[PDB]
């Protein structure tokens, strides 16, 4: 089972120029990249780098293209300031959770 006592899946959304958007899993909400620096990653594994960096301790193993697109309002396009504007939609990357054997 799952924790139900958290909103959501950990998650990555990116839009080139825009700062990384991730999934606060405690309210549901998009959060800002963490360092307020990041902006989108063109390989599959650095996107699972950047899983792992703003999930350090989730023990994120690998990551998966999402099935629904979405759309974020106001996106961050620097600093961590600058971010009033038009919706975006996206869709994003689910940071997957491995069993260790
Ligand atoms: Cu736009």
């Given at each position: 089972?799952?924790?139900?006592?958290?909103?959501?899946?950990?998650?990555?959304?990116?839009?080139?120029?825009?700062?990384?958007?991730?999934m606060?899993v405690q309210?549901?909400?998009?959060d800002?990249?963490?360092?307020?620096?990041?902006?989108?990653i063109?390989?599959?594994e650095?996107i699972?780098?950047?899983?792992?960096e703003?999930?350090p301790?989730?023990?994120?193993?690998?990551?998966?293209e999402?099935?629904?697109?979405v759309?974020?309002?106001?996106?961050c396009?620097?600093?961590?300031?600058?971010?009033?504007?038009?919706?975006?939609?996206?869709?994003?990357?689910?940071?997957?959770?491995?069993?260790?054997?």
């Amino acid at each position: 089972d799952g924790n139900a006592g958290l909103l959501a899946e950990p998650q990555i959304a990116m839009f080139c120029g825009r700062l990384n958007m991730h999934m606060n899993v405690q309210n549901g909400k998009w959060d800002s990249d963490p360092s307020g620096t990041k902006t989108c990653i063109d390989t599959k594994e650095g996107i699972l780098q950047y899983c792992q960096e703003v999930y350090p301790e989730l023990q994120i193993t690998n990551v998966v293209e999402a099935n629904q697109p979405v759309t974020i309002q106001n996106w961050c396009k620097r600093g961590r300031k600058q971010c009033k504007t038009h919706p975006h939609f996206v869709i994003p990357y689910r940071c997957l959770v491995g069993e260790f054997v």
